[PDB]
Amino acid sequence: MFEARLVQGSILKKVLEALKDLINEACWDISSSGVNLQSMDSSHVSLVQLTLRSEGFDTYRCDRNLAMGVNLTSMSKILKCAGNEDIITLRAEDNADTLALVFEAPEKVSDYEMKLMDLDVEQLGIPEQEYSCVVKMPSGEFARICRDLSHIGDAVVISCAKDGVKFSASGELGNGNIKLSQTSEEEAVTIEMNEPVQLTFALRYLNFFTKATPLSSTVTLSMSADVPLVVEYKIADMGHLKYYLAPKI
Amino acid sequence: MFEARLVQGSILKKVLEALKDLINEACWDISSSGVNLQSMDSSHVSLVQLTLRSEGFDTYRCDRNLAMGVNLTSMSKILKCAGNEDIITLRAEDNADTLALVFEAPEKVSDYEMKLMDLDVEQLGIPEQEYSCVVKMPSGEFARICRDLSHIGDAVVISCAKDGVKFSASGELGNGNIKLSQTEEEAVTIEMNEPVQLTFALRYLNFFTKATPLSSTVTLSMSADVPLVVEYKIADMGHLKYYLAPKI
Amino acid sequence: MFEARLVQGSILKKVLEALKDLINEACWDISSSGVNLQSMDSSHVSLVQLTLRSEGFDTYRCDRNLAMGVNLTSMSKILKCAGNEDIITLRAEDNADTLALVFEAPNQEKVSDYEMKLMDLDVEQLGIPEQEYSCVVKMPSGEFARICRDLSHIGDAVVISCAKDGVKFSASGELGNGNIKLSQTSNVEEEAVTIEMNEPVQLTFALRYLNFFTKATPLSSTVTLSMSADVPLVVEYKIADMGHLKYYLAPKI
Amino acid sequence: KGSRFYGNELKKEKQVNQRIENMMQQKAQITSQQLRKAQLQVDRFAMELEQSRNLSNTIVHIDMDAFYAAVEMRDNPELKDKPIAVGSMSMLSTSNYHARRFGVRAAMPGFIAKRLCPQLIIVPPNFDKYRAVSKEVKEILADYDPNFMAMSLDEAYLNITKHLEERQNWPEDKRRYFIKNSVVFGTSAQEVVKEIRFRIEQKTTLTASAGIAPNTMLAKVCSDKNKPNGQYQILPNRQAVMDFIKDLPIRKVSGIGKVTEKMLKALGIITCTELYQQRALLSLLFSETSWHYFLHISLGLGSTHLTERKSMSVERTFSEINKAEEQYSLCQELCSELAQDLQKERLKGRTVTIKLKNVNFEVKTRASTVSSVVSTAEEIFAIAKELLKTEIDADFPHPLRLRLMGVRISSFPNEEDRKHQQRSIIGFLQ
DNA sequence: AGCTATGACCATGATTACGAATTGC
DNA sequence: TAAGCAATTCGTAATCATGGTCATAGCT
Ligand SMILES: Cc1cn([C@H]2C[C@H](O)[C@@H](COP(=O)(O)OP(=O)(O)OP(=O)(O)O)O2)c(=O)[nH]c1=O
Known part of the structure; x- marks a missing residue:
């Protein structure tokens, strides 16, 4: 019951x-x-x-x-x-x-x-591993970014380095480059960078990820190499909502 | 003139x-x-x-x-x-x-x-009845109850007893069974004589409840097998009444 | 560079x-x-x-x-x-x-x-030289967008007439001629509809475009219109003292 | 007779007869005035077709003689004077010419033909040998034209419009070969094909038919005229294309099969002259591409100058199934074997279309397009188990009694769309 | 509570996908 | 008890991209 x-x-x-x-x-x-x-x-x-x-x-x-x-x-x-x-x-x-x-x-x-119905979703998930780049940024800005490159193309290039992180997209009307430079209480940009990693993803899932925007104001993007991008929102005192996305090429 | x-x-x-x-x-x-x-x-x-x-x-x-x-x-x-x-x-x-x-x-x-135009007029009278139940509820809450009930089915069964007015529905998923109990211009008052349980169709009540911004509160007026009055009273000008007939 | x-x-x-x-x-x-x-x-x-x-x-x-x-x-x-x-x-x-x-x-x-x-094209620099007008009307912007969105439900043509005491926006249709009448303002923020004139104006324009022309309404808070005979209507917006944006549209027949 | 196969072809017979009557009801409602504008339009377009009827080239088709049987006969010297049958007791691929006259044909079961000849042998093939004996012939065919177009493993359209002129100044030992020197072949257009047949003969220890034509569809049927180990020829002149285009059944041309045969037995067609005599009938009756094909097969027109993969499937038949776990497990082997064969050419597909067959013979091709390119044995199976799920549970109290399942990767991408290859998530999960 | 923003809901061609039928080897 | 691949044809219909409308809310 x-x-x-x-x-x-x-x-x-x-x-x-x-x-x-x-x-x-x-x-x-x-x-x-x-x-x-x-x-x-x-x-x-x-x-x-x-x-x-x-x-x-x-x-x-x-x-x-x-x-x-x-x-x-x-x-x-x-x-x-x-x-x-x-x-x-x-x-x-x-x-x-x-x-x-x-x-x-x-x-x-x-x-x-x-x-209800009878649904059999797959009983498997990503095993517990370690990650290389962990950005934490204001989620209004993350939603603005993922909705601000779909006007260009359907490929985002997240290039992560020490001073900041850069989002670039190249489509049939041109290209674009948004650069986040690290901070100086919840407009805080913390980059736990280890190895500078450049990857490319599909924006037709990054726009559907940003529909949990009022569930938090801080979002953690966690990347590695040959490993899916993680976008994580934290529902306060409750739990979390994570989104894994596969990369191109 | x-x-x-x-x-x-x-x-x-x-x-x-x-x-x-x-x-x-x-x-x-x-x-x-x-x-x-x-x-x-x-x-x-x-x-x-x-x-x-x-x-x-x-x-x-x-x-x-x-x-x-x-x-x-x-x-x-x-x-x-x-x-x-x-x-x-x-x-x-x-x-x-x-x-x-x-x-x-x-x-x-x-x-x-x-x-203007020229239509062929129909002056039909309404014989005034003595209603079994007349309820007064704030207009926005009725607009919300019908508009949220419309997603569930189309057969609204309005029930009424002295303790409570009980909207039901059904549909392809399950019955959205709203209540409202006996309770300051935003109150719910129930004048009851005999308990009522009568069917209506929501797809015209949705056309009715767009008179919600006229008054703060509405009055429903019901009898057994008589078409119901949904009345939105403009203050000190008159009223606007809608009549709907039950089904089956 | x-x-x-x-x-x-x-x-x-x-x-x-x-x-x-x-x-x-x-x-x-x-x-x-x-x-x-x-x-x-x-x-x-x-x-x-x-x-x-x-x-x-x-x-x-x-x-x-x-x-x-x-x-x-x-x-x-x-x-x-x-x-x-x-x-x-x-x-x-x-x-x-x-x-x-x-x-x-x-x-x-x-x-x-x-x-x-980019791309590359060639456009006509059809130069608009110095002219003198007949009537100028300086008015709010939300009001002009409201007036044109009203009269575009009635008909699809507009007679605009300007006289010493104000302006008539007259829009006939299939269901009865709408009419909105505006007058000046003496000693009053944005509400001033200052209408100056040397000779009166009755011209006529379409309304497929004055639902496009007043899409510029968040750019300013006063639009101006200018009119004369055998010269198109001049719909002028000012920007934050950087310059301006003109639309031109001609009378009908 | 009265089989389940007889039942489904009976239903198909009802359907084709229903379309026969639906055509005859639209055939009666035309007049002698409706035979005017369409006839004038299709013969104006036929004037635009036949005026530029260019046939300066010489297209050769080269079939074989019972290919799947003959390549066994070059590798089975015991029973060369015997009728051979490849396949097994369900279907025959092709049988030889010592059995064609007796009825042992293609598209015929292994029980229909075997009750006709009690003295026969039926041996399953060896599909790896034919892929080499094709390439051995293709080595000879590449010399006379580099742009030869092998349709199957044996048919071969060749263009010898250029090799013949560059053969005139040759000596009498470059144009002379040896029996495995032997007889010198001349410089004529018959002789180049005699040379080709001689080389394929004494380089594979076999025989091969041939056919010379000004066009491709003429070559396909001239290769059947003098059929076993023989040949034929048409001359490039617009009169001589008409004397062979008459007196031909339409059981012979490719592209007019069995049902478009019976839908033309109604309108009184046997020869292509009769098929030409119904311009405004067939132009209004049949569909656009089909009346195009009929008007261009009428004058004998087609390809005057000769020209990747688009699908890859695995289907498999079996006995009667009635369980629930066996279908889900047997879809995985068909996903796996196709995933093996998909990487040998290194192709990234993005569509899986399962295809099921009842025990009373209905096709059900259920398709699903994804955006992740599909290569591996686990990135297919999670696109086909969600179609076996949609079409097992839509018979809510009853199972599926299937006899054939089959998967089909499709929509292989370009060069413009292989540089943006999105990946599945099932590579990463665990 | 109006103005404007803007996100949910909806009409709707339209390209793209689905599916049975037919032809070949 | 009647294959195994591939290719192609047309008509059906699913999904998507599009602008319009409506409701609720931040700002006035
Ligand atoms: C027609 C057909 C051929 N095949 C195979 C078997 C044949 O050996 C091979 C060649 O097809 P074909 O060359 O048309 O047939 P064939 O060469 O066996 O007989 P013929 O020389 O009289 O034309 O392809 C099938 O598997 N199934 C079929 O339905």
């Missing part, structure tokens, strides 16, 4: 506004320590991994491990009905095919029910 | 933007009682009843008793040309088929001379 | 926003006096003219009077990648195929260098 009371409703609205454009279905693992999500999209280019652990929920309880497949556009149509303040009470029984959302306004107690 | 000068010009704007979606042409009955309209939609289910009294028109003058047929789309596209702080002067003559409008601004007047 | 730094980095995000659906290729005569542009559009009736002179720039150097063939749609797709309060520097070599744009934020940590591939 999974049961989860979240006193800040806009966290769940923001998460499933982030994940509905890139992937379109998910298979949530809900176990005794939090909610986990592991999903690669259709083209098998990106991966999205998500953990919200069982401590920033204002109440959480679960008695047996559940696997819950969810159409994310159906859940993003149901969760469009809460306001920005509804205490959201997701309940779900174990062997029933419906997830009962119960909103609660701060007595307008809605009660929505959704159908 | 009919002249009707209204000083809160946003009233007619919110009315006609609530009417141009549903019905196409309609009849304006112009008398000493004020401005009257009863019309049906183009699918013959909903019944629009607009009543404007003569007390709060800032100057009224209506000698004969006229009837003016208008196409509401052209009338509303003229009623998207004035600010929310203007003085409306509606005008008509018996020597012309032109409904004149003048928008006065506190130094930009706006003259319009809209065409 | 040519390098030009300009501190108001929003003016090129608005001058090159009022000119992306109207025209699509133009001739930036970059010379010692400053940036110009002249372009009749894709229908060859409306004459855009634009001037950013030298003394309003932050810094500015060139001696080779070059003539860049600039694609305005792609250039607006690049200038829509800058912040509002940035600082914009233009860079060009002499025999250059490309042109470099520099967006420096005042936060100074982020700097942007875009590089735009």
Whole structure:
């Protein structure tokens, strides 16, 4: 009998506004320590991994491990009905095919029910390794950058060095070069550079990554060589939302 | 020489933007009682009843008793040309088929001379019933409840008991079962006689709730098997009532 | 070489926003006096003219009077990648195929260098010589955008008449002639609609273009219109004392 | 007879007869006035076709004589006077000329023909030998023209419009070979082909038919005229192309098969003169490219001057399956073997199209295009298991009873699109 | 609460993809 | 119990890029 009371409703609205454009279905693992999500999209280019652990929920309880497949556009149509303040009470029984959302306004107690499905997402992820360049930057600027090179081309060149990091794109209308130079309290640019690494990615996934922008204001880009780019947002006191993307050539 | 000068010009704007979606042409009955309209939609289910009294028109003058047929789309596209702080002067003559409008601004007047038409009028009366339940709820909360219920299905089952008014629906995913309990111009008041559970269709209530910016609060008026009234009261001008019929 | 730094980095995000659906290729005569542009559009009736002179720039150097063939749609797709309060520097070599744009934020940590591939065309420098007018009307900008977006729901032609006491914007249609009447202002911010005249004017214009011409409305807060007989309507915008932007459109029949 | 195969060809017979009646109902609704503007247009375009009917070249087709059987017969000296059959008890590739007259043909099962000849041998082929005996012949063919165009492993369009003129000033031992000197071959256009056939004969220990024509489609049928170990020739003159274009069935031309045969038995066509006599009928009735093909096969027109890979598939048939795990596991072997064969040419595909066949014989090609280029045995299988998933679970209470699955990499990229090769994520995951 | 920004939702050609059918070797 | 590859044809239909509209919110 999974049961989860979240006193800040806009966290769940923001998460499933982030994940509905890139992937379109998910298979949530809900176990005794939090909610986990592991999903690669259709083209098998990106991966999205998500953990919200069982401590920033204002109440959480679960008695047996559940696997819950969810159409994310159906859940993003149901969760469009809460306001920005509804205490959201997701309940779900174990062997029933419906997830009962119960909103609660701060007595307008809605009660929505959704159908699940049988989805078998792949039960594998990137093993734990070490990374070479770890930039940490303001996430409004990262979203502005990933939405400011798609007007040029569909290839971004992230060239990372010690003084800063440079984003360049070259397409049929020309080319462009944005250079980040390191800092002098959350406009802070910290570059844990080791080896200067130059890579190239697809912007049609970097624009879908930047739809978790109001989930934080600090984003960590973690790169290496022959290894996917990591973009990470931290949902405050809750957990994280990571995006892995594969490079070109 | 009919002249009707209204000083809160946003009233007619919110009315006609609530009417141009549903019905196409309609009849304006112009008398000493004020401005009257009863019309049906183009699918013959909903019944629009607009009543404007003569007390709060800032100057009224209506000698004969006229009837003016208008196409509401052209009338509303003229009623998207004035600010929310203007003085409306509606005008008509018996020597012309032109409904004149003048928008006065506190130094930009706006003259319009809209065409009328000639429709074949239908004066249908409403026998007044004694309603089983009349509820009063703030207008925005009803607009939110219908507009968020429209994504779930189309068969809204409005239920009513003395403790609570209980909207249900269904659809291809599951029933969005909204409640509202018994509860300061933003309260919910339930005048109940017998418990009601009656079906309606949301795809016209969505056309109804675009009269939400008229009043702060709406009143629903219901009886068993009688078509319901959804009433949005302009303060001290009249009201705008919508009639919908239950299904099955 | 040519390098030009300009501190108001929003003016090129608005001058090159009022000119992306109207025209699509133009001739930036970059010379010692400053940036110009002249372009009749894709229908060859409306004459855009634009001037950013030298003394309003932050810094500015060139001696080779070059003539860049600039694609305005792609250039607006690049200038829509800058912040509002940035600082914009233009860079060009002499025999250059490309042109470099520099967006420096005042936060100074982020700097942007875009590089735009040019083309080459020849445009008609159909010179507009010194004229004298009949009526001038100096008015708010949101008001003019509101008036034209009102009358474009009624009809699709506009009679504009100017007399001693003000202006009539009269727009007949299939559903009844709209009419909006404006008068002067005596002793009052932006509300002043100052209308001066030597002889009255009744001209007539179209409304497919006055929903394009008042796309320049965030560039200023007062537009001016000028009119006479057998001379086109002059729709003038001023920029932050760097120069101006004129649109020209002719009467009908 | 009354087989499942008979049932599906019965349904296909119903469908082609339904299209026959749908054509005859559109055939009756034209008049003698609808045979005017279309006829004038197609014969104006035929005037634009036939006026520049350029045939200064001499195109040679060179088939073989029961190729898959003959290359076995150059490597099996025991039974040279016997009828041989390659394939197995399901399908025959091609059988030899000691069995063609008896009925043992191509596209025929291993049980239909084998009940006709009780004294026969049916031996499965060796597909590695033919790829070498093709190249041995191609060594001889490259000498007479460098730009020869081998369609299959045996057919070979050659252009000898230039080699013949540069043969006139040759001595009588450059134009003379030895039996494995032997008889000197002349300088005529028949003689260069006699030389080619002699070299392919006493350099592979085999025989080879041939055919000389001014065009390609004429060569394809002239290679069938005097068929076993023989040849033929047409002269390049616009009269002499007409005397052979008559009195030909359309069971012979390639591009007019079996069903477009039966859809022309309706309109009374056997010879190409009758096929020419229906200009405004066939121009209005059939589709655009098909009436193009009919109007250019009528006058005998085509390729006057001669000219990479676009797909790569693996299909596999098996007995009846009714389980759920066996389909998911057997799609992986077909993903793997195709991933082996995809890297030998080093090609990056970006589409996987699975193709399933019921036990009562319906095709189901379910396609899926990705943006990651696909090369390896695990970057395919995660594009085809999501199509086996969509078309197993769309029969919600019932299994799939298949007999053939097959994968097909497609859309191999250019030089403009191989420099931006996006990669999959399944190379990186674990 | 209007102005403007701007992100969600929606119409909609349109190129691109899908699929059965047909032809060859 | 009736193959195994490849290539091509047309008509269906899925996805995408496009501008327009609407709602809610930061700024006035
Ligand atoms: C027609 C056909 C040929 N093949 C193979 C077997 C043949 O040995 C080879 C050549 O095809 P063909 O050259 O047309 O046939 P063939 O040479 O065997 O017989 P002929 O000389 O009378 O033309 O291709 C098939 O596998 N399947 C088929 O349907």
